[PDB]
Amino acid sequence: MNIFEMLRIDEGLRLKIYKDTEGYYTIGIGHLLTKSPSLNAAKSELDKAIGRNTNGVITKDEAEKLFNQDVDAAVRGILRNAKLKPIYDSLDAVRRAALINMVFQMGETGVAGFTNSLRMLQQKRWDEAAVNLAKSRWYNQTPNRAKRVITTFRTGTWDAYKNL
Numbered sequence: 026m027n028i029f030e031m032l033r034i035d036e037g038l039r040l041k042i043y044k045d046t047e048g049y050y051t052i053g054i055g056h057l058l059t060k061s062p063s064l065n066a067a068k069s070e071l072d073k074a075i076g077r078n079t080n081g082v083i084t085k086d087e088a089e090k091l092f093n094q095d096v097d098a099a100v101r102g103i104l105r106n107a108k109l110k111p112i113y114d115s116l117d118a119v120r121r122a123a124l125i126n127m128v129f130q131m132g133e134t135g136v137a138g139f140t141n142s143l144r145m146l147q148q149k150r151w152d153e154a155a156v157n158l159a160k161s162r163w164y165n166q167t168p169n170r171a172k173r174v175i176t177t178f179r180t181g182t183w184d185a186y187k188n189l
């Protein structure tokens with residue numbers, strides 16, 4: 026297991042524009058296109074992102090290319106953020122993937138807002154961090170995914186993803 030495999034499980038793979046859990050146009054492996062309710066806007070983006078006039082469908086290789094970029098951008102965002110960098114630096118590699126996962130799903134700004142959870146993580150109070158992380162809109166809206174990510178932070182193992 027690794028961050029790519031982890032996120033592939035959590036986000037799935039769809040080759041045509043679809044709506045994510047929040048109702049937002051997305052494609053490939055969780056690549057958010059826009060928060061706009063306009064499909065045309067989403068199609069625009071798709072074309073910009075892939076570099077060609079697509080008509081809302083992409084190939085698997087194209088989906089994987091956006092995913093590679095997206096994982097890299099999440100790591101990049103954590104590293105540039107004053108609130109997240111120290112947390113990321115303090116973690117082991119399995120927990121680092123859990124944080125990248127959160128940032129991919131909600132964005133740098135979003136995760137940096139998790140102040141208290143972040144502090145418990147940096148303190149390495151795993152059980153407490155896990156309880157705290159669950160007290161969130163994130164957990165309530167995507168509880169199965171959240172539980173997976175939280176278990177990863179709690180244990181430092183991939184047990185939540187094995188068998189998937």
Ligand SMILES: [Cl-]
Nearest residue numbers: 073074091094
């Ligand atoms: Cl993009």
Ligand SMILES: [Cl-]
Nearest residue numbers: 167168169170
């Ligand atoms: Cl879920």
Ligand SMILES: [K+]
Nearest residue numbers: 036037045055
């Ligand atoms: K998805």
